[PDB]
Amino acid sequence: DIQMTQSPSTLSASVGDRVTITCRASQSISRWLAWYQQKPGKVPKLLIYKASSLESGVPSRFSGSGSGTEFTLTISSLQPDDFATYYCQQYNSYSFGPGTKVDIKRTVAAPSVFIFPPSDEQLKSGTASVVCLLNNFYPREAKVQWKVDNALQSGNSQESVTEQDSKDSTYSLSSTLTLSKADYEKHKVYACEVTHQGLSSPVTKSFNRGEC
Amino acid sequence: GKLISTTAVPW
Amino acid sequence: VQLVESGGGLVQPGRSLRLSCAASGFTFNDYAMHWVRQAPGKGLEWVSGISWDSSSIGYADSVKGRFTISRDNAKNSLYLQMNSLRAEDMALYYCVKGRDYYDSGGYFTVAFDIWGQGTMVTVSSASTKGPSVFPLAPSSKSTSGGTAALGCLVKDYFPEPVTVSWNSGALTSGVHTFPAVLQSSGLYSLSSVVTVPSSSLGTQTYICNVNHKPSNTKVDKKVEPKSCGRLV
């Protein structure tokens, strides 16, 4: 069993940058390593194989090096076609690295944070969904924590994120806390606490069920 | 070392 | 040059599917051939492979004993027989052509140079179901500057996909419709949100149009303001 790791997991880049991303094998794989590009909804594309051979038709700004356990993929001058996720794979036994996503750098933008109580219609059905919206932020990394009467929640929320916006290059994210009606009715304060590079302190959006 | 390999070559 | 997969679809856990891949535009018999899968929103996982001469076969640990790879060179076809399917086998399955290389006494794949578009495999015990659509009501807790956020929670449907529009396509600016999430119940859920001017709020009608073709469900939900705390 050969573990492939990749670093960084994400990278913010600009057209014209030289970007180098890393792939590592838990044991020697000699030169039997290939790099693939993949974009949302599209098929992966072979870029490099045997560690450093450039595939026919692939632009020469792409290069690969390494042998044994440490491998690198380099883009000498990033072009708009190159924003994508990049995967390495070893050919002793075909395990893939977890991927490196190269997205479009823009200025740091803190999310705008909004909270939504459950609807009467939904409560009537026996469930309560509480939604927290993080709108138009960058970079992608963001932490959302739920608190119910100030007790930190775990295991009862799920989040979803958009792809990077093609015009303003931001992300948006929802986090949804799901409870039974009875549990929702046992507490009073529902709060979404957001941490993000664009914020000097965490932002909390909250409501009191009895006022809402 | 190879999970899948053959000694035979298609040429 | 092309690889065309078929055989995918919806199957219940424990049942079987047989995938096919028809190759054209290259000498199929001369190449190792492989299957790679990608679960929704996740990375790539190699599944199975077979050498050009069929003498050597391999499987990912996660599928071995349950999947069988084979090829029919006369029909320029590759196959994957998948038994005892689980939820974790849900994925788009790509048929993939290998490029091979001789080293240290052996001939082995070093690249996957041609990939099919994939055939989608959905493994679920869930029954087809239309969503319930709930308002994400704009309130004093969902404003930011001169704007208010509102939306619709499209909950508990199966299978993917649903579509969401706002005011029949008239409202598109500021709309974010999130990828669905698969809940522990086996049903999907999704929210669609939009930011609007707060100065017309409650006077201006906002209706989300939700369509779930698999259940022939069409829901238009008017999203009304909500009192949630005091003005600020």
Residue numbers in the entry:
A (entry chain D): 1 to 212
B (entry chain G): 600 to 610
C (entry chain C): 2 to 52, 52A, 53 to 82, 82A, 82B, 82C, 83 to 100, 100A, ...
Could you share sentences copied from the article?
The PID is an amphipathic 15-amino-acid region that separates the two heptad-repeat domains found in the post-fusion conformation of gp41. Cluster I anti-gp41 antibodies, including patient-derived 3D6, 7B2, and F240, bind to the HIV-1 PID region (HXB2 isolate residues: 596–610). 3D6 has a near-germline configuration, and F240 and 7B2 represent anti-PID antibodies that have undergone affinity maturation.
The PID peptide bound to Fab 3D6 adopts an elongated random coil conformation skewed toward the antibody heavy chain. The binding of PID to Fab 3D6 is achieved primarily via interactions between residues 601–610 of the PID peptide and the loops of the three complementarity-determining regions (CDRs) of the heavy chain. Specifically, CDR-H2 and CDR-H3 form the bulk of the van der Waals and hydrogen bonds interactions to PID. The CDR-H3 β-finger via Y100D makes two main-chain hydrogen bonds with the extended PID peptide, creating an extension of the β-finger into a pseudo-antiparallel three-stranded β-sheet. From the 3D6 light chain, only residue N92 in the CDR-L3 loop forms a main-chain hydrogen bond to PID L602. In contrast, 3D6 does not bind the PID at the interface of the heavy and light chains. Specifically, the PID peptide binds in a groove formed by CDR-H3 on one side and CDR-H1 and CDR-H2 on the other side, reminiscent of known single-chain nanobody interactions.
